[PDB]
Design a protein around this ligand. Structure first.
Ligand SMILES: [Ca+2]
Ligand SMILES: [Ca+2]
Length: 296
DNA sequence: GGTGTCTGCCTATTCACCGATTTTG
DNA sequence: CAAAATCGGTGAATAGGCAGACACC
């Protein structure tokens, strides 16, 4: 019930969020309410993860995000110390670290209770401007000053495989590809491991090829949006390098079940039963019940 | 009677996921 | 030939967010 600290950090870099909110109290101008919060949104299927986090930090409350999503939110200021203490001993790796540093800075402003002053609000506004989506339209109208939006870029290395397990449990992918040969009935099995991330962490993505000794970064795109995908398709790399890593460092959530099914198919290929008409039908049945196909 | 804490509810997109074709040893 | 590399997607679980009730200093 108490997830490993480095697995938790890796998952946080994938799903976590450090939020600084600045709003008007009772729709009154020149009177701003400021508050900090940490939150992680997951599908209802992985609500157990959020509860495991809730047992590790002993803070936060889980509520419904939507009809298919729950979210763990830490809104108590005193409880935010638990979050800060954690990420000081197990630091973030992605560009979210920059958000955390800005998050901690706002914490100090609020801890000194300077957020109840004019100059304190002006400081938090400048902090929020570099956090996440930055200042909204209404906030930008209230503070038309040329505030710096940019932040110092984060360039860190993977601390350990325990972090990687948490990060992969969040953004990894274990897929089975049935390359159906056209003009025939024969189908070949290819295993597919993937880790997707925005282009803003390109440096960290490229390090995956070295840290795992395999795979290649694929620059993918949708409309005008772009991201990267670390992909391993060679069975030797998957069976000898990829799989043993996540056998050592266990995954969390429903994706663990996909990995277990993923290894079950790997064993069949390892025994060359994937070429068997019987073994392929078995693979076809396993594939149908993993990932998006999994309904139970 | 102000501020902090909590929750219902929302939107844009960064993901996870997908089948298939072409290249290579 | 079978595997590996490569292509070309896209629905949605995300990653942040908006607004206000209200317990409490
Ligand atoms: Ca992410
Ligand atoms: Ca995820």
């Amino acid at each position: 019930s108490s997830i490993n600290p480095w697995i938790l950090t890796g998952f946080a870099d994938a799903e976590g969020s450090f939020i600084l909110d600045i709003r008007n109290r009772n729709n009154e101008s020149n009177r701003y309410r400021t508050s900090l919060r940490f939150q992680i949104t997951l599908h209802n299927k992985d609500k157990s993860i959020l509860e495991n986090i809730q047992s590790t930090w002993k803070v936060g409350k889980i509520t419904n995000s939507s009809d298919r999503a729950v979210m763990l939110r830490v809104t108590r200021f005193e409880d935010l110390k638990v979050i800060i203490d954690h990420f000081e001993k197990y630091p973030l790796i992605t560009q979210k670290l920059g958000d955390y540093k800005l998050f901690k800075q706002a914490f100090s402003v609020m801890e000194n209770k300077e957020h109840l002053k004019e100059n304190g609000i002006k400081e938090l506004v400048r902090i929020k401007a570099k956090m996440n989506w930055g200042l909204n339209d209404e906030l930008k109208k209230a503070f038309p000053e040329n505030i710096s939006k940019e932040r110092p870029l984060i360039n860190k290395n993977i601390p350990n495989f325990k972090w990687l397990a948490g990060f992969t449990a969040g953004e990894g992918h274990f897929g089975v590809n049935l390359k159906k040969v056209k003009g025939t009935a024969k189908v070949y099995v290819g295993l597919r491991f993937a880790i997707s991330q925005h282009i803003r962490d390109k440096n960290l993505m490229n390090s995956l090829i070295t840290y795992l000794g395999c795979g290649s970064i694929r620059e993918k795109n949708k409309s005008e949006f772009r991201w990267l995908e670390f992909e391993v398709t060679k069975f030797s790399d998957i069976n000898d390098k990829i799989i043993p890593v996540f056998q050592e460092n266990t995954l969390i959530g429903v994706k663990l079940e996909d990995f277990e099914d993923w290894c079950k198919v790997a064993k069949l290929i390892e025994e060359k039963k994937h070429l068997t008409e019987s073994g392929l039908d078995e693979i076809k049945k396993i594939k149908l019940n993993m990932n998006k196909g999994r309904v139970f």
